[PDB]
Enzyme design. Structure first.
Site, PDB file in Angstrom:
ATOM      1  N   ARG A 112      -2.871  13.566   5.428  1.00 20.71           N
ATOM      2  CA  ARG A 112      -2.149  12.366   5.016  1.00 20.71           C
ATOM      3  C   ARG A 112      -2.345  11.225   6.017  1.00 20.71           C
ATOM      4  NH1 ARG A 112       1.338  15.817   7.361  1.00 20.71           N
ATOM      5  NH2 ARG A 112       2.509  14.978   9.148  1.00 20.71           N
ATOM      6  N   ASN A 113      -2.675  11.563   7.266  1.00 24.93           N
ATOM      7  CA  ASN A 113      -2.887  10.560   8.313  1.00 24.93           C
ATOM      8  C   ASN A 113      -4.348  10.197   8.572  1.00 24.93           C
ATOM      9  OD1 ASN A 113      -0.097  11.853  10.297  1.00 24.93           O
ATOM     10  ND2 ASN A 113      -0.115  10.544   8.479  1.00 24.93           N
TER      11      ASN A 113
ATOM     12  N   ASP B 270      -2.405   6.180  12.054  1.00 21.84           N
ATOM     13  CA  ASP B 270      -1.016   6.403  12.441  1.00 21.84           C
ATOM     14  C   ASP B 270      -0.777   6.911  13.864  1.00 21.84           C
ATOM     15  OD1 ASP B 270      -0.379   7.620   9.023  1.00 21.84           O
ATOM     16  OD2 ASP B 270      -1.065   5.682   9.771  1.00 21.84           O
TER      17      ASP B 270
ATOM     18  N   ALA C 296      -8.509   0.385   4.262  1.00 20.24           N
ATOM     19  CA  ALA C 296      -9.209   1.567   3.754  1.00 20.24           C
ATOM     20  C   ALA C 296      -8.990   1.609   2.248  1.00 20.24           C
ATOM     21  CB  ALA C 296      -8.662   2.830   4.402  1.00 20.24           C
TER      22      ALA C 296
ATOM     23  N   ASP D 281       0.040  14.039  15.708  1.00 20.56           N
ATOM     24  CA  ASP D 281       0.381  14.015  14.291  1.00 20.56           C
ATOM     25  C   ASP D 281      -0.873  14.009  13.409  1.00 20.56           C
ATOM     26  OD1 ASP D 281       2.297  11.803  12.069  1.00 20.56           O
ATOM     27  OD2 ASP D 281       2.055  13.983  12.055  1.00 20.56           O
TER      28      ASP D 281
ATOM     29  N   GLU E 178       5.121   2.934   1.419  1.00 19.41           N
ATOM     30  CA  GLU E 178       6.178   2.997   2.428  1.00 19.41           C
ATOM     31  C   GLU E 178       5.946   4.156   3.400  1.00 19.41           C
ATOM     32  OE1 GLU E 178       9.209   1.523  -1.024  1.00 19.41           O
ATOM     33  OE2 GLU E 178      10.046   2.924   0.447  1.00 19.41           O
ATOM     34  N   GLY E 179       6.316   3.952   4.664  1.00 19.77           N
ATOM     35  CA  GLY E 179       6.126   4.981   5.673  1.00 19.77           C
ATOM     36  C   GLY E 179       7.403   5.552   6.254  1.00 19.77           C
TER      37      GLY E 179
ATOM     38  N   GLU F  51      -7.496  -2.531  10.117  1.00 21.51           N
ATOM     39  CA  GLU F  51      -8.456  -2.584   9.020  1.00 21.51           C
ATOM     40  C   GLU F  51      -8.003  -1.881   7.750  1.00 21.51           C
ATOM     41  OE1 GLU F  51     -12.257  -0.363   9.478  1.00 21.51           O
ATOM     42  OE2 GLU F  51     -11.634  -0.161  11.577  1.00 21.51           O
TER      43      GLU F  51
ATOM     44  N   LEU G  68       0.803  -1.214   0.000  1.00 26.54           N
ATOM     45  CA  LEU G  68       0.000   0.000   0.000  1.00 26.54           C
ATOM     46  C   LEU G  68       0.846   1.278   0.000  1.00 26.54           C
ATOM     47  CD1 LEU G  68      -2.765  -1.224   2.442  1.00 26.54           C
ATOM     48  CD2 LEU G  68      -2.760  -1.181  -0.062  1.00 26.54           C
TER      49      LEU G  68
HETATM   50  C1  AA2 Z   1       1.572   6.686   6.917  1.00 28.93           C
HETATM   51  C2  AA2 Z   1       1.871   5.472   5.996  1.00 28.93           C
HETATM   52  C3  AA2 Z   1       2.507   5.974   4.659  1.00 28.93           C
HETATM   53  N1  AA2 Z   1       2.841   4.590   6.688  1.00 28.93           N
HETATM   54  C4  AA2 Z   1       0.553   4.654   5.815  1.00 28.93           C
HETATM   55  C5  AA2 Z   1       0.282   4.063   4.557  1.00 28.93           C
HETATM   56  C6  AA2 Z   1      -0.891   3.311   4.337  1.00 28.93           C
HETATM   57  C7  AA2 Z   1      -1.818   3.134   5.377  1.00 28.93           C
HETATM   58  C8  AA2 Z   1      -3.069   2.343   5.137  1.00 28.93           C
HETATM   59  N2  AA2 Z   1      -3.603   2.361   3.864  1.00 28.93           N
HETATM   60  C9  AA2 Z   1      -4.753   1.677   3.559  1.00 28.93           C
HETATM   61  N3  AA2 Z   1      -5.319   1.661   2.296  1.00 28.93           N
HETATM   62  C10 AA2 Z   1      -4.852   2.282   1.160  1.00 28.93           C
HETATM   63  C11 AA2 Z   1      -5.508   2.035  -0.072  1.00 28.93           C
HETATM   64  C12 AA2 Z   1      -5.069   2.645  -1.262  1.00 28.93           C
HETATM   65  C13 AA2 Z   1      -3.968   3.513  -1.245  1.00 28.93           C
HETATM   66  C14 AA2 Z   1      -3.464   4.196  -2.532  1.00 28.93           C
HETATM   67  C15 AA2 Z   1      -2.096   3.565  -2.937  1.00 28.93           C
HETATM   68  N4  AA2 Z   1      -1.513   4.168  -4.177  1.00 28.93           N
HETATM   69  C16 AA2 Z   1      -2.531   4.602  -5.183  1.00 28.93           C
HETATM   70  C17 AA2 Z   1      -1.841   5.222  -6.433  1.00 28.93           C
HETATM   71  O1  AA2 Z   1      -0.933   4.278  -7.031  1.00 28.93           O
HETATM   72  C18 AA2 Z   1       0.096   3.862  -6.111  1.00 28.93           C
HETATM   73  C19 AA2 Z   1      -0.526   3.234  -4.826  1.00 28.93           C
HETATM   74  C20 AA2 Z   1      -3.326   3.756  -0.028  1.00 28.93           C
HETATM   75  C21 AA2 Z   1      -3.759   3.150   1.165  1.00 28.93           C
HETATM   76  N5  AA2 Z   1      -5.381   0.971   4.537  1.00 28.93           N
HETATM   77  C22 AA2 Z   1      -4.908   0.913   5.805  1.00 28.93           C
HETATM   78  C23 AA2 Z   1      -3.734   1.587   6.160  1.00 28.93           C
HETATM   79 CL1  AA2 Z   1      -3.156   1.476   7.812  1.00 28.93          CL
HETATM   80  C24 AA2 Z   1      -1.557   3.721   6.634  1.00 28.93           C
HETATM   81  C25 AA2 Z   1      -0.389   4.468   6.851  1.00 28.93           C
END
Ligand code: AA2
Ligand code: AA2
Ligand code: AA2
Ligand code: AA2
Lengths: 280, 280, 280, 280
Positions: free
Chosen positions: A146-147, A160, A98, A142, A23-24, A96, A21
């Site tokens: 973005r969070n 986060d 998202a 925080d 990198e953090g 979960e 999904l």
């Molecule tokens: C803070 C950090 C960065 N560590 C971070 C990164 C991701 C998440 C997180 N993301 C999703 N779901 C989700 C679905 C689609 C996309 C979009 C992904 N993207 C779309 C465009 O093409 C490249 C991929 C992104 C997330 N669900 C649960 C969590 Cl806990 C939480 C924190």
């Protein structure tokens, strides 16, 4: 090394990792499938884990996040902790999933078309989540677009908790130096006075509202973080976004009062925001 | 700056400072008299306060100590928090008074004459206090003879909570670097692994027993703190004090097992110590 | 554990410890006698060492102080490092002996009788010492009366470099949180902006002058450290001490300009102070 | 806020930002074009800068990196600092451009085809760079494949000095807790003893060699960072990579001796590596 917790432990063979999904700052999250809900069928989840170059801070942050999500509890406007693989093997934090992604990227996309009525609803959900958090005596530290993640059907979820803290018995007066928080979302007492309270979070919430009403705009446009230190002291604040009620901007400006006690509590933001929605 | 707390606030005019009990690491304590107990008469107390050269750390430690004593609660084997002057003026932490002084200085004196039966009783009280503390989910991190006070009638009271922590929801895994704890009382995981648990406190308790049975002796005699880092890794431990039951030394040696889980819990030290007293 | 340094190493058998000069924040200092100067006869010195309850911070501070005194160099207005016992045994930092004691206690005594001409001379020496220090690119961070010693014949010597830093190549911009410095001697940028420069030391020097001209008076009399945080922001400053030239108070007030660049450099304080002495 | 430096300052109008090279831990780097070399023509460079969510740590790290590259000096096996935009505006750190990318990604690609002779040459360059660094009294603290860039014509360049330190006069004995360094590249004394020396860097170099001879392989394959703490104590080490001389593996194993003094110095790795190349 990590101790055990029976009520939250989840078997590694019932988990199937997949698409990353993103990198953090202290690891990464990947899409997965887990067999265990009480149906006992495959439900999509997100797994937060470390990378090869992980540091001890990264390790301690992720563990902290897992421990915070346990004391916080169950709420719809926050991402819930589903399970965790700690015993014998790499740490896995199961939360979960998202589907829509993060609020910032989400908003910057639709600028189908989105309405103003939505933005007030979106902001209201977030106010509810933070009210609950504050009730649980937790300071996020925080809060930002973005969070905040958005699921299918558009539910706003605060995520986060790696930097969050437990304020139940201890407040860390003059101990929190706050050097790891993004400056453009920090309250003055956080930046200069070595303290952090619920009132500090309302300030950040104020900045979160600005991000929403600008459709994923970057705070203090044209102003680099390096000069923000003196500007904040001068009394500088952001101005009203073209696409925002004059009543909304006053709420923002209210979260931005230099004196913490003069800012609105999260309960107040709940009542007032609830009012505006009904009249929208 | 400090917030308010009605239930613990105490009027400054009802307090009369006096003889200085001694200077500390982050302030000082002086003897005082306070009108407010529910008799409403003058009872002697001890007041912890800052000095002129106080640092922000000193400030944060004292506040932390006040906040810790509130969540810990009421117990006879620990010094209780009576009141506090926070609003408008210098911070004052009002705790109970201990007439005999600190355990270390106390013991080094009588070497009238003191008996062995006393030493086991003395150690038993301390085991009780620490059991309670652990139950409240608090880690002291600075258990030592110098930090144990003895009142009139000889009740053992654990003091100085400036370094104590709240482990209720958060344990600080890989976050506690422990650079401010006295090395001769630190457990190996505390010194090298960036963790601190209740098992870490039992180790320190083990060293506390040695201090007692040597009548205020200094741990690792002849061994400077600077070489203790390598010795502790080698498996070096202190030997039996001439004036100690062979059953006691085994308890000490048990608190000193390199593996934390192999050490006895505070509840165990309670049961076993209770047994020996009855047979003394 | 500590590495070796041939040019500074001193044999333990040629040292005889004695009367304790006083306990400190991270150890203690005792009077001693050392055979090795190049006469090779017994000269009195002071030995800084750890205590039984030493912490790793205490250890690291003392080592830091030893390493700082080596890069600083030889100067008459600072206490010089004579030798050190690091190899096999307890760390001993051998520095020169000051017979009169610390400036604060010294001054508070004679209030035989001391003159105004002395106070300007006393202040001038200190200005010279700090000019040299700044030239060596070292920031003291803990300049105060209690940290200035006076030898026989009355030479002013700046001591206690446990908190000092090497600014030769690195300045620690936004890294120095300064939580261990006494607040009543700290400059505003030090307290709130996470920085420390030579200009920050001039502020402290300003407070040092006040201590001198009040004969060991305590800064911000009647004002507790806890309320000083807001007062300093309000622009509050100390007023002129009855027994101080109107030209002196302006120098103090000049060290206290909120803007660091508007304060005088140590070289300036040297020239201006030199002028006043000639006309005294 | 940032002070000025004439010799390194570079006009903002002579810089044209472009393609983002990649996001980092405390900012990001983008490709650019700068007019100012002494030809006075457009040469491609890399610009390190902050992001919108930058923290004070991020800010302090980038500034630290700029200040480190100035004291280190000019060397071919390290990325040189070309210029910097500090005055009035966002901080920009201008360093040289590396066309091939990072060593890790580079190596994992060619597995045209690359030879063994290359790998020894590649390792030799790196040994030279680190020898120079150590001579300048700088400890990198983050040596890894991902932190080594390769230009056109294949020159090995050590990058990312955000975590590097100045050891000229101060060594930080018992002060460096090292919680922000990747664990799989850390030496035991770094992880447990609160110290970091040149010998600690040789250990990391040992791990760097393994990455090279495995063509960008991840250290301790199959072993999560969380269990590495106990394994490292047990004496566990990595085994020989199939595609490595038995003389090479002994060099690695030599960098991995638990005792720091028993490991080879960077000068030694220079002589010995130079020998093997001639015989390849
Ligand atoms: C803070 C950090 C960065 N560590 C971070 C990164 C991701 C998440 C997180 N993301 C999703 N779901 C989700 C679905 C689609 C996309 C979009 C992904 N993207 C779309 C465009 O093409 C490249 C991929 C992104 C997330 N669900 C649960 C969590 Cl806990 C939480 C924190
Ligand atoms: C940790 C530290 C140092 N900050 C510290 C110092 C003192 C206390 C403390 N001490 C007492 N009572 C007491 C009575 C007599 C003496 C003996 C005093 N002594 C006797 C010999 O002559 C000189 C004075 C000492 C104490 N009561 C309550 C407290 Cl909370 C707690 C912590
Ligand atoms: C900062 C700290 C505390 N660690 C500290 C403490 C002491 C010194 C120090 N003191 C002296 N000489 C000296 C002579 C007389 C007296 C007076 C002693 N006093 C007089 C009154 O009766 C009791 C003892 C005091 C000192 N010389 C060198 C040094 Cl390096 C430095 C730092
Ligand atoms: C540590 C960190 C991350 N902050 C970082 C990131 C980048 C650099 C850096 N990179 C290059 N040059 C370069 C050229 C090509 C590619 C490859 C880019 N990649 C190729 C594949 O497709 C996507 C883009 C990468 C870099 N030059 C100078 C520097 Cl100072 C330094 C540190």
């Amino acid at each position: 090394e990590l101790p055990e917790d029976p009520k939250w432990e989840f078997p590694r063979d019932k988990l199937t990792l997949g698409k990353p999904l993103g990198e953090g700052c202290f690891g990464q999250v990947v899409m997965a499938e887990a067999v265990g809900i009480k149906p006992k069928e495959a439900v999509t989840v997100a797994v937060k884990m470390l990378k090869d170059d992980a540091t001890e801070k990264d390790l301690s942050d992720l563990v902290s996040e897992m421990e915070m999500m346990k004391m916080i509890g169950k709420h719809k406007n926050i991402i819930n902790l589903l399970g965790a693989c700690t015993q014998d093997g790499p740490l896995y934090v199961i939360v979960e999933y998202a589907s829509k992604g993060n609020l910032r990227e989400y908003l910057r996309a639709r600028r189908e078309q989105m309405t103003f009525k939505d933005l007030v609803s979106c902001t209201y959900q977030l106010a509810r989540g933070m009210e609950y958090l504050a009730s649980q005596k937790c300071i996020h530290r925080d809060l930002a677009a973005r969070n905040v993640l958005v699921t299918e059907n558009n539910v706003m979820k605060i995520a986060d908790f790696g930097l969050a803290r437990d304020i139940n018995n201890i407040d860390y007066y003059k101990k929190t130096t706050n050097g790891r928080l993004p400056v453009k979302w920090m309250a003055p007492e956080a930046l200069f006075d070595r303290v952090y309270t619920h009132q500090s979070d309302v300030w950040s919430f104020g900045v979160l509202m600005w991000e929403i009403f600008t459709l994923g705009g970057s705070p203090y446009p044209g102003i680099p973080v390096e000069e923000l230190f003196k500007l904040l002291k001068e009394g500088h604040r952001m101005d009203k976004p073209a696409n925002c009620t004059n009543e909304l901007y006053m709420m923002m400006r209210d979260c931005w009062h230099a004196v913490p006690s003069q800012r609105p509590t999260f309960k107040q933001l709940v009542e007032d925001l609830d009012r505006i929605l009904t009249l929208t």
